[PDB]
Write a protein that binds this ligand. Structure first.
Ligand code: NDP
Ligand code: 11F
Length: 157
């Protein structure tokens, strides 16, 4: 299976100045649950924004840099390389990789953050005419989770 895994706000913002614009531990738990024991594929900039691979899953970084080498990270140099990765593969970020992959993936796990944040990085536009809502689950508002958010699982029609 090839899936997108993303959190975006009401205007599809996913990032600002190398950071997630919001703080939502519940969504990090969601990521951990979905992707543990599987594979994350991310662009070079997304990886460097996090700085270290996420534990207990395969971390794959897409870059043109032939010297790129990080402990606990597997490197690929082409989009075509993604299709050779075994198991459940999650396209993890960023804007560039999402733009290259949105027309290719089987499904998308999207956390819709019900706010409007300042951003410099965006998920590509998409229409529900193309995507069936397999599930839609409201996140719980919390001491440490104070922004409304909805977990969507979308499957290509
Ligand atoms: N929510 C998120 O996913 C977050 C992501 N970001 C980020 O994304 C922001 C915008 O940059 P964006 O370009 O979207 O980031 P990406 O993570 O998509 O990284 C882009 C880089 O990935 C590599 N890459 C992408 N496609 C190819 C390809 N077809 N062949 C070879 N290499 C490829 C290149 O690396 P190289 O240049 O080394 O060759 C390219 O410059 C950055 O500011 C970064 O912080 C920021 C905050 C949050
Ligand atoms: C390791 O967690 C992160 C992941 C990211 C990348 C960009 C991501 C993502 C992502 C999230 C948070 N949610 C969903 N649903 N999909 C994603 N791809 C960025 C910063 C962080 C981060 C780094 C340090 C502290 C807190 C968060």
């Amino acid at each position: 299976t090839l899936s997108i895994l993303v959190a975006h706000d009401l205007q599809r913002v996913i990032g600002f100045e190398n950071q997630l614009p919001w703080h939502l531990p519940n969504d990090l738990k969601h990521v951990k649950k979905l992707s543990t024991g599987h594979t994350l594929v991310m662009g070079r900039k997304t990886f460097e924004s996090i700085g270290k691979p996420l534990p207990n899953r395969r971390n794959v970084v897409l870059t043109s840099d032939t010297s790129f080498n990080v402990e606990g990270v597997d490197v690929i140099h082409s989009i075509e390389d993604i299709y050779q990765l075994p198991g459940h593969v999650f396209i993890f970020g960023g804007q560039t990789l999402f733009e290259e992959m949105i027309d290719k993936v089987d499904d998308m796990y999207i956390t819709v953050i019900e706010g409007k944040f300042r951003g410099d990085t965006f998920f590509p536009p998409y229409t529900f005419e193309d995507w069936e809502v397999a599930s839609s689950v409201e996140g719980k508002l919390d001491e440490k989770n104070t922004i409304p958010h909805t977990f969507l699982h979308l499957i290509r029609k």
